Design a protein around this ligand. Structure first.
Ligand SMILES: CN(C)C(=O)c1cccc(-c2cn(C)c(=O)c3[nH]ccc23)c1
Length: 101
């Protein structure tokens, strides 16, 4: 495929280019981030977003943007400001929203 799926796949590709290490590529595990699942109630990541596009679960660009923001907000909640994940989350949140509008 639908027009929305095509546009969201385009946005997702452009967003993932901003995360060359793939920190946001897959769900965060508790092994990597102790206690993550007990702190972050609604996890999100680019891989889950891709699966949601393919399953045609996004019906508006607004919904896709909300998942993107949720992913970045989670990183700015779990991690301290002086960490690579917090800094990257903040950077891509702002650049991603601009790129998408
Ligand atoms: C060297 N490492 C640990 C990694 O390449 C790697 C791998 C997988 C996940 C993450 C990670 C991602 N995000 C979004 C976090 O908020 C976070 N906090 C602590 C780790 C992470 C880091």
């Amino acid at each position: 495929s639908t027009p929305i799926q095509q546009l969201l796949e385009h946005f997702l590709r452009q967003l993932q280019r901003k995360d060359p290490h793939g920190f946001f590529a897959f769900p965060v595990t508790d092994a990597i981030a102790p206690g993550y699942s007990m702190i972050i109630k609604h996890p999100m990541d680019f891989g889950t977003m891709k699966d949601k596009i393919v399953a045609n679960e996004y019906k508006s660009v607004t919904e896709f943007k909300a998942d993107f923001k949720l992913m970045c907000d989670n990183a700015m909640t779990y991690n301290r400001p002086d960490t690579v994940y917090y800094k990257l989350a903040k950077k891509i949140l702002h650049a991603g929203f601009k790129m998408m509008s």
